[PDB]
DNA sequence: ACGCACGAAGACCAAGTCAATGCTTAGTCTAA
């Protein structure tokens with residue numbers, strides 16, 4: 144079962160790329176030693192081959208959101224929006240092993256390695272939630288195969304396809320946002336400001352003297368609060384395509400996926416919680432080539448069976464199933 | 472040797488611990504080293520605990536650990552074998568870069584196990600496949616199992632030397648990381664991309680991850696001189 | 712019964728295989744997928760992964776392998792080291808612990824190890840055209856590869872999508888099926904190039920360490 | 934009353950890198 148979700152991000156999407164990369168004030172990535180350098184946290188870029196500038200094949204980087212991040216976002220959305228309220232309604236309680244399995248598929252609950260009988264595999268892989276995301280001490284094969292969030296760009300034509308050519312962006316989609324942290328003590332201006340500080344003026348004087356001495360020592364050869372740097376993000380408004388496939392899905396699993404897609408807009412993508420990065424709105428959801436996204440979320444006469452099945456599953460779901468899956 | 476657990480009774484010669492159960496069912500493989508646990512052997516049910524984060528590398532779901540793995544799971548064994556090379560003669564330390572260069576350029580002929588940890592101390596005793604032939608060395612680095620070919624390492628070193636032969640400022644042709652964590656690990660540098668022939672670039676792009684990891688410790692501006700690693704089995708036995 | 716060349720084209724980068732990626736293993740996985748869709752998930756996978764349209768080579772000692780060479784890896788771009796992590800949201804777990812959803816008495820999470828361990832791992836991603844040589848039925852192999860969508864590994868996160876495939880009959884002189892894990896006592900005349908002795912499994916599954924045997928592994932393919 | 938919490942501890946060598954994409958020039962008449 145193929146799920147095609149068209150995602151447009153209202154706010155920039157920031158997936159931090161590993162590594163210590165530098166940038167200058169003018170915007171030159173990795174400036175030479177001559178000019179000043181400031182730390183930069185670039186976006187997650189994947190090397191892809193594309194026909195750039197009428198070339199036969201060019202390995203150009205493409206800013207994407209990692210597929211594992213999308214998988215974890217879907218899992219967290221399910222847990223925090225349908226699974227956890229359903230278990231709370233029954234006053235269910237989970238041990239550490241079951242909870243770790245449910246939230247990250249971590250086998251710490253029973254790292255011995257437990258055999259699974261064929262009947263047990265049949266029963267558990269049919270679970271509405273744990274079947275999609277395999278793991279735990281048993282560590283099955285999940286039925287969910289979610290792709291990365293490839294932007295609809297010129298370089299992603301051979302990964303996305305030509306079905307959504309109308310929304311492609313020709314130029315670059317990355318922008319550098321500069322951050323700064325200021326020492327609050329240096330911004331005091333009157334004894335009224337320093338009234339709340341227990342040391343009053345003396346504490347601020349000692350703080351400023353220590354800062355000056357540390358700065359002088361560092362210039363001659365403990366880190367203060369003051370810091371200036373930038374992080375690279377993907378510009379807002381770019382459309383993204385998310386491809387989700389479920390292998391041999393039951394009605395309950397598809398219903399759960401649809402519920403998560405309904406509640407997915409409330410969550411964020413990748414990082415940037417402080418700056419409200421990653422906010423997005425679902426534009427279209429496609430089920431096996433059939434559009435299902437109504438303005439009131441995923442609905443229609445062709446998905447009532449999935450919603451009914453998942454509602455029935457939520458009605459009878461208990462923590463004992465999670466414990467059995469986690470071998471706790 | 473044949474199995475990772477074989478290092479105990481062959482180079483450490485440690486007798487089995489007391490109070491171990493005896494198998495009396497149809498033989499099943501060890502949960503760590505995949506060694507068969509036949510009738511009449513000594514084992515113990517798995518009690519790894521909640522801090523065991525290597526369930527993905529377990530050989531089988533037998534939940535049984537042979538006495539050799541029970542020895543190899545001791546803290547003194549895990550700490551001592553963090554940067555070890557276990558051959559027939561003894562256990563050698565490959566922590567230094569010169570030792571790694573010697574291992575990946577002049578490997579010992581006998582079967583050996585190569586150890587290396589990516590953190591303070593990790594379970595590596597029971598996850599390393601044996602190296603039957605020195606021309607195909609299997610190295611376990613943290614959670615990564617690497618394949619290193621000494622001929623590929625030698626060819627890459629020759630390529631780097633020929634590319635840096637003329638220029639006075641030595642510069643690596645390929646980006647490498649000791650931790651194998653950088654996003655540019657294994658990618659050609661600017662010097663390699665715009666100063667190497669097509670054959671050299673194709674060879675450098677078509678190397679195994681283990682070869683990149685090894686070159687990250689061998690290939691440098693001043694190539695370390697290979698030297699024989701010291702015998703370490705005495706220290707591990709004394710600390711046990 | 713016929714000599715074949717299998718070509719696979721990628722629409723997404725795949726995980727570069729650490730060891731040999733064998734055509735017979737992929738065909739067995741696809742056959743197991745077919746019998747799963749036809750019977751369900753209660754089947755024994757070991758009972759259907761040898762029903763492949765490939766004829767077998769048997770050595771003197773009875774050790775047998777499929778005549779299906781390991782996939783050749785030709786890279787259209789430099790390998791990219793892909794980074795992935797794993798973490799349980801500590802604030803979310805703390806909230807659940809407060810509300811009784813989680814039964815944890817421990818005061819603090821331990822990012823170094825345990826239930827709340829943060830882990831960092833890497834695997835390489837490559838753009839490649841997968842070419843391998845085998846002896847079997849063209850129609851059945853093409854039918855099996857028709858249902859294959861992803862190649863290599865890390866398929867849960869969508870690595871190695873198949874843009875297309877092609878199966879062609881080629882002369883025997885091009886390249887043999889021998890570029891695989893052959894048994895220890897295989898005849899020298901049928902081996903293409905140098906073969907180093909190592910430990911690997913001869914029949915799929917190839918990750919089962921209990922099935923591992925001393926085998927001749929091609930040096931120019933590992 | 935076995936299970937879980939919680940600090941101390943023990944391996945300990947250690948480099949070179951950090952761009953990946955630029956590209957031109959006027960005929961159609963065949964529905965209101």
Ligand SMILES: [Zn+2]
Nearest residue numbers: 501504537540
């Ligand atoms: Zn064992």
